[PDB]
Design a protein around this ligand. Structure first.
Ligand SMILES: CC(=O)N1CCc2c(c(N3CCCc4cc(-c5cnn(C)c5)c(C(F)F)cc43)nn2[C@H]2CCOC2)C1
Length: 114
């Protein structure tokens, strides 16, 4: 059993580490808006959207009961971006950098949470 504030204290720094990447977190800060961006095929390809603002809200509102549920949403965000965007694109390469940072930050936190 993990208490909400235990999860918030342990995991929020790992989310802040992603937000600190600039420009690399910029495409991920808010839900993808396909009409605004001019990419109307987005939801044909990405069935379960996820982004940093949604993860932050979930962490602030106790929606994660175990740390793996948070890890899963971060990875869903990355997998969506590697699925949708081309390998040469900014968003894909920025996703790869966020995945590197997240891997580095989450490991000691998972060890601490036991
Ligand atoms: C995560 C995902 O799959 N998305 C889908 C594709 C996408 C996203 C963004 N978004 C989201 C809005 C904020 C944003 C900001 C930047 C940005 C601003 N300043 N800097 C230095 C970078 C970039 C840029 F990296 F492309 C992209 C995006 N655009 N697109 C393409 C549409 C036109 O072009 C690329 C989201």
């Amino acid at each position: 059993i993990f208490k909400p504030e235990e999860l918030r204290q342990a995991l929020m720094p790992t989310l802040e580490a992603l937000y600190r990447q600039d420009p690399e977190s910029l495409p991920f800060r808010q839900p993808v808006d396909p009409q605004l961006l001019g990419i109307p095929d987005y939801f044909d390809i990405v069935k379960n959207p996820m982004d940093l603002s949604t993860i932050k809200r979930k962490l602030d509102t106790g929606q994660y009961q175990e740390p793996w549920q948070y890890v899963d949403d971060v990875w869903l965000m990355f997998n969506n971006a590697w699925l949708y965007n081309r390998k040469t694109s900014r968003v894909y390469k920025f996703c790869s950098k966020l995945a590197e940072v997240f891997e580095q930050e989450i490991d000691p936190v998972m060890q601490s949470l036991g």
